[PDB]
Amino acid sequence: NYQPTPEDRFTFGLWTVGWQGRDPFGDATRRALDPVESVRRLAELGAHGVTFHDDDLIPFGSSDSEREEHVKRFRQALDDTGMKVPMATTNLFTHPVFKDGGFTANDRDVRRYALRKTIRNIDLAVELGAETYVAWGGREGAESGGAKDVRDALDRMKEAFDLLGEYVTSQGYDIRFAIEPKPNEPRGDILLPTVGHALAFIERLERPELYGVNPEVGHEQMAGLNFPHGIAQALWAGKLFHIDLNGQNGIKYDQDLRFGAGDLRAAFWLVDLLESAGYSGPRHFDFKPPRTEDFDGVWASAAGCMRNYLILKERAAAFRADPEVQEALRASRLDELARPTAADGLQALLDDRSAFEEFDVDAAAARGMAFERLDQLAMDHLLGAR
Amino acid sequence: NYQPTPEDRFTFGLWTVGWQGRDPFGDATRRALDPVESVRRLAELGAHGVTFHDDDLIPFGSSDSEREEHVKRFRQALDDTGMKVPMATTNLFTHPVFKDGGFTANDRDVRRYALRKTIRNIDLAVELGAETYVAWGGREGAESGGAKDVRDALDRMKEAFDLLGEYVTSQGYDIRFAIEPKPNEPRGDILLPTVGHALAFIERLERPELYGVNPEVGHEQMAGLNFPHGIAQALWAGKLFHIDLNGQNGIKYDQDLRFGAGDLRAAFWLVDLLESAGYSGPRHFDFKPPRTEDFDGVWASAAGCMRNYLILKERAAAFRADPEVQEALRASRLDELARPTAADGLQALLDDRSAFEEFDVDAAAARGMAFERLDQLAMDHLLGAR
Amino acid sequence: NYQPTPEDRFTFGLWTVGWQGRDPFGDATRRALDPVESVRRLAELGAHGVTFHDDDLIPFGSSDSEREEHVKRFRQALDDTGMKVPMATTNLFTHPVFKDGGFTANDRDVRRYALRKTIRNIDLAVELGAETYVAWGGREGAESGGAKDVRDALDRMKEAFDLLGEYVTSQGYDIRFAIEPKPNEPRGDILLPTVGHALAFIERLERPELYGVNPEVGHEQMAGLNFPHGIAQALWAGKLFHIDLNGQNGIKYDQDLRFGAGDLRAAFWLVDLLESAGYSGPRHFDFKPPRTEDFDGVWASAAGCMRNYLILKERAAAFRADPEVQEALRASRLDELARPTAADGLQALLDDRSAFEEFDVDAAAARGMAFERLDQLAMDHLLGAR
Amino acid sequence: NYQPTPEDRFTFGLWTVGWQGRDPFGDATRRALDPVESVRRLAELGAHGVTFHDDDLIPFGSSDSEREEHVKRFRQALDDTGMKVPMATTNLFTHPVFKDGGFTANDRDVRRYALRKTIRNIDLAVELGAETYVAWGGREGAESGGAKDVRDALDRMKEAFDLLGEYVTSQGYDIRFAIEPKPNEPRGDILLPTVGHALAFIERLERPELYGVNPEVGHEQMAGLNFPHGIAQALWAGKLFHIDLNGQNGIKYDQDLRFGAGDLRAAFWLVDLLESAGYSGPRHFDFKPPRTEDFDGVWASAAGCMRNYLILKERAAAFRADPEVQEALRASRLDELARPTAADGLQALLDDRSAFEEFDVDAAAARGMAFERLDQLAMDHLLGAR
Ligand SMILES: OC[C@H]1O[C@H](O)[C@H](O)[C@@H](O)[C@@H]1O
Ligand SMILES: OC[C@H]1O[C@H](O)[C@H](O)[C@@H](O)[C@@H]1O
Ligand SMILES: OC[C@H]1O[C@H](O)[C@H](O)[C@@H](O)[C@@H]1O
Ligand SMILES: OC[C@H]1O[C@H](O)[C@H](O)[C@@H](O)[C@@H]1O
Ligand SMILES: [Mg+2]
Ligand SMILES: [Mg+2]
Ligand SMILES: [Mg+2]
Ligand SMILES: [Mg+2]
Ligand SMILES: [Mg+2]
Ligand SMILES: [Mg+2]
Ligand SMILES: [Mg+2]
Ligand SMILES: [Mg+2]
Ligand SMILES: [Mg+2]
Ligand SMILES: [Mg+2]
Ligand SMILES: [Mg+2]
Ligand SMILES: [Mg+2]
């Protein structure tokens, strides 16, 4: 009954189940978790692996020998459980030095520090076997218009990512980068606020093949955008390197609800797309168990992430396999959308009088699209009524 | 006192002052304007030129000889007034045949018709001297998840724009294309919903140098995004071919208020950026005089568009020239944001102990950014209090 | 299998299935329906009744004898089908005379006309057996700040509703009024924009017992509000006289999708509340079949409204009856929320040292709320996984 | 030049300039301020007074003698500076015990504790001379649908406020209560989410005359609502007891920018209304100096709050006094909006054939409202261009 196993490739950040529940208006409601205990607990739930910021694993300001002890204990728990580390990232947002950003801070010495802190963790990520290195520029942005010249900031952002690409190529590392967009919070506006802006920026880097996106359900929904549409564009560009799964109820602060909560039908269409397109990367949950919960609620919330993915996968597969849905998809001309508009070429199109001079525009206009019947078949499948 | 002249390059769509006031809940409140009368009236107000959809100028279904008469009358009014036509576009959204889109309609024969209708108007636009051809795919999208496979739709969208680029290159035309994003309305979600998504899509076309964006103030604000930030990214990419200026009060239906209405401080920062970056294209107003107004209100609203641009241009120039603002910009390290992070290169950065091992993180963190004083100088300048 | 019958009390506006598909950017895609054919078709689908604006049933400007013929034909179709008319309303938004409002138009003569048009239709509604008369003030509002003094406008709004209440009391009619809030569209901001503002306004009318609310799913969601929470407050006040059911995908133009579309989990919690609280009024669908559809799609969309209500009713009933959910509700202390805080009274509370001086705040804080496990049981029930 | 003095009645919360800059993603960037130093600094800037939560002034868990020392030091600074304390409030949101609310927590013992903590601070507020006691129920709400039966929660909310009203009446205190709405954050949805919902709830309390609202600019804008419209409704009801002034850029997390930032034109229309209606309460700033700033930026931001109010007051007064604006207001029939619709009464309206049978609907419809010219005069005045 919807039991996950490590072959489902479900992963969690240490910072997710480890969130102590401090929000802008309240103190922590839960004690800190030891990273080793989170690995063991997630393994028992059926997770495939974990992800980390540098500062989740090694407390900021650790000596080189404290650092080695923290890594050794962690590696022992991975060895004991079979858990993998497919992704890692840098914390360039918590410490006060990053209050105006890391890569695009106005102060040049902070930008250099940010790059050195990042490079140190790329080495550790490669050592632990990560294939993707995520960058979330949560402090790159502004609350006011004159504080940040955005063209200069984009020059600095490109400079930073180009240097990171020079570093991993010169070291011979097999790792790729994924940029995680967010439109706002904690800055009033954040640079590269959506999947689209991030994809566009990547095409201006010196080695674009090293960079993709790590979209997050809730972040695109904080701009009111359709998250499965944005994922489709990332897959179309060949840039979906990683994904953050969670839930969000509309345009408000980043809630990071468990996956399946928030916009349930968008979750269904997302799973349909990921499974249809054959996405093979980790199914990563970036979520926060609500601060109302104790530790039993933390693990129930994490289990629910995986459960909802597996229920929606079953319902989406049943939808696509249903002969009546296949009939309805042809009724709505999804087959024709997949055929070229003008494989005969430009000149043939220009000479084709059935495309304009003799085209019966009123008869084409009268054809219903039959989209509502198709969508109710999708609803029946989602609700198990079919 | 803030009087426009044609050298300010203010342009208006025929459909703007010509909007009859029909909305989803009400009939028209104004009679139709003759395009010739709109040209003459806008010229008297100080406009530089006008723009048009094919169907604004030539009623849909006109014979080839009615077409010639409509164009001749129009050309005579341009000759009489000195007005230019810098941009033109196609109506692929009003007629019922386009109810599921033009370039990405599921029906293949509609897609071919859409391309033929577009090509016919590119010829006319070149004849009238337009330098930019805008595409707004207002019907390209969906209300439900199964109606539109977005990867196939993006294939069809790329196919259409590639064919248009083959057409203008084979004809030897000096015209470029600009894609106008909008996130929603009239479709539940529209493909290429923001500036970012459009910029990313352009980089996958066969001849990307022919395509840029035509962002609209209100459209990016319907997703809660920072419009001057998005314009900066378009300028950074070298893709700001055209712009639509108007006003919008937040996340709701597309209001198309006169420019300066809506988010006034965003309008100030937009003008600052366009003038600082030396944008030389048309300052185009895509706005709707509210349906409360009679024809005297139409021309007052149009005049207000230009007036507000010129007031904000004056205030932004005073801001940037003020020695006290120049001092504050250095106080906030805007000068340092413009300097390379690591012109010394990767290896020097790695060997620079002042970038990490000896970096005094607490002393850097203690430095205030002085952004609030800078922003209050900007407010004082905007309000004329300085 | 989820078949509606008239005892389920599903009703539809004539303007819903009759929407021709004209939106702000496009012409109609469907021909007009005769009201008689809509009654017959809805009866065959299992509807209980229909609702109407005056102008849906009697074309604007009809002679008194054309009026009588339109009503007679309509009454014959009701007699032939068994369909009821539980609600009626006035169109104070389509005609250009209402461009600045009806009850709160700045022009006094328009306000008087609006009241006379309303009163004429109250007589007809009573004749057809309606129990509720809805007012939706879609044009009452403003696009700019100086156009409307809102205190004077609220005086005029109160004046109008007080006169309508004087009219129905002096006539001896058994009808009540329901105010339908909407935050915006077609005006930039609409007066009484949410359920809350409407409830507050009612308490200042001379005969508040005659007035309640008619909330609409999509309208509260256009302000990002929780629609089941708002309905609970209306039920708490005893003011839920009628309800408009449909779907909406977040903060954007009013989509009026079929019920169950949009925010599916909010639809589940709404049905749970209406059924638990014993709401006995009509389940009215104010929805628009998308303009992509032909007439077969219109009736499929209408059928889907009813189907989704009945599926969600079944799932909500299964949730509330499940012993494991009953256990979880006590685990989360829903039983304690229903018990008085201080039935012992103020003085006893003040003297109760276990409420403050001896209250163990850390032990209370440590108690998990168990809300995530409860919510996953609700998800399992919704998806039929339980 | 726009210098505040204590007669302008500008007040600040201790928690505003005292915000250390901890947000959901980052540590504090500023040290804690001593309340005594904040009083002295605000007095030098021209403030009239300060406000406080119980826990801002007396650290949580203080002994009764530490409590007395904290109050004495505070009272000495008030005596030294002339500063007043017009409002006070309770912190029912920071401590983990309040994670599911105070007055509407599911656990009954937490609800009793919340009432005792509140009552203790009402006594102190009266001792310091406060006239208004604010309640902001920031934790009253839910992230999921089954966690909170909202009708039971409203019963508990009414119970709590009724007991507080019994307490202040039995003690003979001259203090009134003001409910501060917020739609979301830190709970997914908060009960009483807007001004309207709060006004409606007050009318169901046992002694409604003791309760009003304390609306906040940014909170109504987090629901996309028009804040001057909501204030007008509160003034119309006679319930504007207090106000929180700040700025917000649209629908996102609560930014609490300095007043004048965010939606500048809404700030202009708010000041116009408050000054026109003769609001005599405190002009209270609930704002957060951005965490980019050091302490010099804190005081610059606070000074800017007051400066922007005084600039906007001048511009609004110039607007209303301008004979050309007075002419335009009559042109737009604002004078007619203030006149009764039907002072002649219902029967006269029914007998008035010029209100319906002989009303020339097309001639009324043709009249322009002249709202755009009026709004451009308002823009010219705001920008000092007039
Ligand atoms: O970059 C990894 C993570 O960093 C921070 O935790 C962000 O809040 C989250 O969105 C992101 O995914
Ligand atoms: O494409 C030109 C114009 O077409 C339509 O009028 C759109 O509503 C507008 O946004 C666009 O700019
Ligand atoms: O008042 C009845 C109906 O009137 C209009 O059709 C509105 O768009 C709808 O929201 C409302 O319910
Ligand atoms: O209740 C007083 C204050 O409490 C908290 O600080 C809130 O964040 C603020 O909105 C409110 O005004
Ligand atoms: Mg996130
Ligand atoms: Mg998030
Ligand atoms: Mg994330
Ligand atoms: Mg537009
Ligand atoms: Mg627009
Ligand atoms: Mg446009
Ligand atoms: Mg509606
Ligand atoms: Mg609606
Ligand atoms: Mg409705
Ligand atoms: Mg606040
Ligand atoms: Mg706030
Ligand atoms: Mg506040």
Element (H, E) at B108: helix B108-128
Instruction: Find chains touching chain D: ≥3 CB pairs under 8 Å.
Output: A, B, C
Asked whether the beta carbons of B253 and B185 are under 8 A apart, the reply is: yes
Q: Residue B301: enclosing H or E segment and its boundaries? A: helix B295-321
The sheet with strand D87-89 has its strands ordered as D211-213, D176-179, D132-135, D87-89, D49-53, D10-13, D283-285, D244-245
- Could you tell which of C11, C14, C15 is best to mutate to test the pocket of ligand 3, judged by most ligand atoms within 8 Å of the CB? C15
Least Cα separation, residue D334 to chain A (angstroms): 36
What angle (nearest 5°) sits at the alpha carbon of residue B95, between those of residues B56 and C94? 85
Q: Taking a C-beta distance cutoff of 8 angstroms, is the pair A16, A285 a contact?
A: yes
Name the residue among C108, A150, C25 with its Cα closest to residue B237: A150
- Fill in the DSSP letter of residue C169: H
Residue tagged 């997710």 (tokens):
A16
The count of residues in chain D is 386
Q: What's the Cα-to-Cα distance from B303 to each of B290, C94, C266, rounded to whole Å?
A: 14, 29, 46
Is residue A253 within 8 angstroms of chain B, CB to CB?
Answer: no
* Cis peptide, bond prior to residue D215, ω within 30 of zero: no
The full 3-state SS of chain A, as one line of letters, equals CCCCCHHHCEEEEHHHHCCCCCECCECCCCCCCCHHHHHHHHHHHCCCEEEEEHHHHCCCCCCHHHHHHHHHHHHHHHHHHCCEEEEEECCCCCCHHHCCCCCCCCCHHHHHHHHHHHHHHHHHHHHHCCCEEEECCCCCEECCHHHCCHHHHHHHHHHHHHHHHHHHHHHCCCCEEEECCCCCCCCCEECCCCHHHHHHHHCCCCCHHHEEECCEHHHHHCCCCCHHHHHHHHHHHCCECCCEECECCCCCCCCCECECECCHHHHHHHHHHHHHHCCCCCEEECCCCCCCCCHHHHHHHHHHHHHHHHHHHHHHHHHHHCHHHHHHHHHCCHHHHCCCCCCCCHHHHHHCHHHCCCCCHHHHHHCCCCHHHHHHHHHHHHHCCC
CA–CA dist D140, D128 (Å, integer):
28
**Phi, psi dihedral angles at D59 (to 5 degrees):** -55, 140
* D343-352 long-range contacts, CB within 8 A, separation 24+: D346/C163, D346/C166, D346/C167, D346/C170, D349/C112, D349/C115, D349/C116, D349/C163, D350/C116, D350/C119, D352/C112
Please tell me the distance from the alpha carbon of residue C221 to that of residue C204, in angstroms, as a whole number. 26
CA distance linking residue A57 with residue A127, whole number of Å: 14
Interface-testing mutation among A91, A157, A233, A248, with chain B (most B C-beta atoms within 10 A): A233
Cα dist from D182 to A127, A143, A279, D136, D258, whole Å: 48, 21, 41, 8, 18
Distance in Å, CA B57 to ligand 8 centroid: 19
- In this structure, the strands spanning C176-179 and C132-135 are parallel
- Amino acid code (one letter) for C296: D
Q: How many CB atoms lie within 10 A of CB A38?
A: 25
**Cβ of D12 below 6 Å from ligand 4:** no
Strand partners for D259: D261
Report the distance separating Cα A375 and Cα B106, nearest Å: 16
Contacts of B119 in chain A (CB under 8 A): 350
Is residue D296 within 8 A of residue B331, CB to CB? The reply is no
Strands (E) located in D119-193: 132-135, 141-142, 176-179, 189-190
Residue C145 DSSP class: G
Give how far Cα C22 sits from Cα of A42, B188, C250, D97, D315, Å: 53, 15, 22, 54, 43
Residue C161: closest CA among C127, C209, C129: C209
Phi first, then psi: give them for residue A211, nearest 5 degrees.
Answer: -125, 135
Burial class (CB in 10 A: 0-12, 13-18, 19+), A5: exposed
In chain C, which residues have their Cβ closer than 8 Å to the Cβ of B15?
none
- Could you identify the residue written with the tokens 């189940």? A17
Q: Determine contact, residues D237/D282, Cβ cutoff 8 Å.
A: no
Distance from CA of A43 to the nearest CA of B (A): 34
Name the strand (E) or helix (H) holding D93: none
Residues B233, A361: C-beta atoms closer than 8 Å: no
DSSP C131: S
Is the CB of residue C220 below 6 angstroms from any atom belonging to ligand 3?
A: no
Nearest partner of C105 among C144, C57, C153, judged by Cα: C153
CA atoms within 13 A on the CB side of B91: 21
Q: Which residues contact D150 (CB under 8 A, 6 or more apart)?
A: C228, C229, C232, C233, C236, D191
Q: What Cα–Cα distance (Å) separates residue A14 from each residue in A58, A61, A151, D240?
A: 12, 19, 35, 47
Q: Point out the catalytic residue in the list D48, D54, D55, D56.
A: D56
The answer to whether residues C129 and C173 touch, using CB atoms and an 8 Å cutoff, is no
Distance CA D50, CA D125 (A): 12
- Structure token digits, residue C164: 């309508």
CA of D27, closest CA in chain C: separation in Å?
Answer: 23
A184 and B CB contact within 8 Å: yes
Q: Which of D372, D376, D386 to mutate to test the interface with B (most CBs of B within 10 A)?
A: D372
Please report which helix (H) or strand (E) contains residue D103, including its range: none
The CA radius of gyration of chain B, in Å to the nearest whole number, is: 23
Residue A181 alpha carbon to ligand 5 centre in Å: 9
C-alpha to C-alpha distance for A367 and C335, rounded to whole angstroms: 55
Q: In what order do the strands lie in the sheet with C176-179?
A: C211-213, C176-179, C132-135, C84-89, C49-53, C10-13, C283-285, C244-245
Secondary structure percentages of chain D, helix, strand, coil, to 5 = 50, 10, 40
- Closest by CA to D302, choosing from D7, D8, D13, is D13
Q: For chains A and D, what is the number of CB pairs under 8 angstroms? A: 106
Protein residue with its CA nearest to atom 5 in ligand 3: C136
Is C253 close to B249, i.e. CB distance below 8 A?
no
Whether the link from the prior residue into B181 is cis, omega within 30° of 0, is: no
- Strand pairing class (D283-285; D10-13): parallel
Q: Does D110 sit within 8 Å of C364, measured CB to CB?
A: yes
> For ligand 1, what atom is nearest to the CA of residue A90?
1
Enumerate domains of chain B plus CATH numbers: 1-386 (3.20.20.150)
Residue B141 bridge partners (DSSP):
B190
> With contact defined as beta carbons under 8 Å apart, do C251 and C223 qualify?
yes
- How far apart are the C-alpha atoms of C334 and D114, rounded to whole Å? 18
CB C230 within 8 A of CB C194: yes
Cross-chain Cβ contact D369/B295 below 8 Å? no
Sort strands A176-179 and A141-142 into parallel, antiparallel or unpaired.
unpaired
Q: Provide long-range contacts, Cβ within 8 A and 24+ apart, for D351-355.
A: D352/C112, D354/C109, D355/C109, D355/C112, D355/C113, D355/C115, D355/C116
Q: Are strands C189-190 and C141-142 parallel, antiparallel or unpaired?
A: antiparallel
Q: Does B252 contact chain C (CB < 8 Å)?
A: yes
Which residues numbered 8-27 in D keep a CB inside 8 Å of some CB on A?
Answer: 21-27
Residue with CA closest to ligand 3 atom 4: C136
Tell how far CA C1 is from the center of its chain.
27
Give me the phi and psi of A24, to 5 degrees please.
-65, -15
C92: distance to nearest CA of chain B, Å? 10
What sign results for the dihedral spanned by CA atoms B28, B33, B39, B41? Answer: negative
Cα of A354 vs centre of ligand 12, distance in Å, is 40
Q: Which of D385, D375, D271, D268 is nearest to D328 (CA)?
A: D375
Single-letter residue type at D247: G
CA C203 remoteness from chain centre: 19
- Closest Cα to atom 11, ligand 4: which residue? D136
Structural contact between residues A150 and B277, judged by C-beta atoms closer than 8 angstroms: no
Is the Cβ atom of A216 under 6 angstroms away from ligand 1?
yes
Whether D53 is catalytic is: yes
Task: Assess D188–A contact: CB distance below 8 Å, yes or no.
Answer: yes
* C142 contact partners, CB below 8 Å, separation of at least 6: C148, C187, C188, C189, D371
The answer to whether the CB atoms of B145 and A272 lie below 8 A apart is: yes
C-alpha span between D4 and D86 (Å, rounded): 18
Closest CA to A176 of A53, A281, A50, A57: A281
Q: d(Cα D351, Cα D346) in Å, to the nearest integer? A: 9
* Ligand 2-lining residues (CB < 6 angstroms): B 15, 89, 134, 136, 138, 180, 216, 244, 286
* Reported structure resolution in angstroms: 1.7
Give the residue carrying structure tokens 């203030």.
Answer: D338
Q: Does D247 touch chain B (CB under 8 A)?
A: no
- Whether the CB-CB separation of D180 and D134 falls below 8 Å is answered with yes
Task: For residue B358, give the DSSP letter.
Answer: T
What are φ and ψ of residue A240, in 5° steps? -85, 90
Q: Could you tell me if A157 and A191 are in contact, meaning their C-beta atoms sit under 8 angstroms apart?
A: yes
Q: After which residues does a break in chain A occur, C–N more than 2.5 Å?
A: none
Distance CA C227, CA C221 (A): 7
What is the whole-number distance in angstroms between the Cα of residue D34 and the centre of ligand 14?
A: 22
Q: Are the C-beta atoms of residues D143 and C229 closer than 8 Å to each other?
A: no
User: Per this entry, what is the length of chain C?
Assistant: 386
Contact D113, D78 (CB under 8 A): no
β-bridge mates for residue D245, sequence order? D285
The dihedral built from the CA positions of residue C46, C49, C54 and C60, taken in this order, carries a sign that is positive
| Residue A31 neighbours by CB distance under 10 Å | 10
CA dist., res. B176 & res. B210, Å (int)? 5
Is C53 marked active-site?
yes
Three-state secondary-structure class, residue B216: strand
The C-alpha atoms of residue A115 and residue A102 are separated, in whole angstroms, by 8
Contact A224 C260 (CB under 8 A): no
- Given a contact cutoff of 8 angstroms between Cβ atoms, the answer to whether B214 and B242 are in contact is yes
Residues in a beta bridge with B12 = B50, B285
By most ligand atoms within 8 Å of CB, the mutation choice from D14, D180, D243 for ligand 4 is D180
Catalytic residue among B48, B54, B55, B56: B56
Cβ-nearest to D94 among A26, A94, A100: A26
Cα A38 from Cα C251, distance rounded (Å)? 38
Dihedral sign of CA atoms B244, B247, B249, B255 in order: negative
- Can you tell me which residue has the tokens 């009701």? C78
Instruction: Give CA–CA dist B161/B164, Å, rounded.
Output: 5
3-state secondary structure of C232: helix
CB A208 within 8 Å of CB A161: no
Instruction: Give residue A134's Cα distance to chain centre.
Output: 9
Is it true that the peptide bond before C290 is cis, omega within 30 degrees of 0? no
DSSP strand pairing (D141-142 vs D189-190): antiparallel
Strand order in the sheet with A132-135: A211-213, A176-179, A132-135, A84-89, A49-53, A10-13, A283-285, A244-245
Q: Is some CB atom of chain D closer than 8 A to the CB atom of A249?
A: yes
Q: Tell me the residue type at A101.
A: G
CB atoms within 5 A of ion ligand 11 belong to C 216
Alpha carbon distance B224, C224 (integer Å): 13
Q: How many angstroms separate the CA of residue B250 from the nearest CA in chain D?
A: 6
C178: helix, strand or coil: strand
